[PDB]
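To the wet lab folks,

You asked to see what we're planning to order before we commit. Fair enough. Below is the target structure as tokens, and below that is the sequence we designed to fit it. If anything looks off to you, flag it before the synthesis order goes out.
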């Protein structure tokens, strides 16, 4: 269920999350081909994140 961010990402809107390279994303569920939903542990931010910006741990 855990992923690691490989690049920084800045949320475009309220439903996305922001994160930094190296952040762990947990409780990840897949939404579609482009997008997952999960929580950036370090900030507590939960929401949509682009799948290309993370990798499964």
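Sequence we intend to order:
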């Amino acid at each position: 269920k855990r992923y690691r961010a490989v690049y920084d990402y800045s949320a475009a809107d309220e439903d996305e999350v922001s994160f930094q390279d190296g952040d762990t994303i947990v409780n990840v569920q897949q939404i579609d081909d482009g997008w997952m939903y999960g929580t950036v542990e370090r900030t507590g931010d939960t929401g949509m994140l682009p799948a290309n910006y993370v990798e499964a741990i």
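Structural context that might help your review: The first strand starts at residue 3 and ends at 5. The chain has one domain: 1-57.

Thanks,
Computational group
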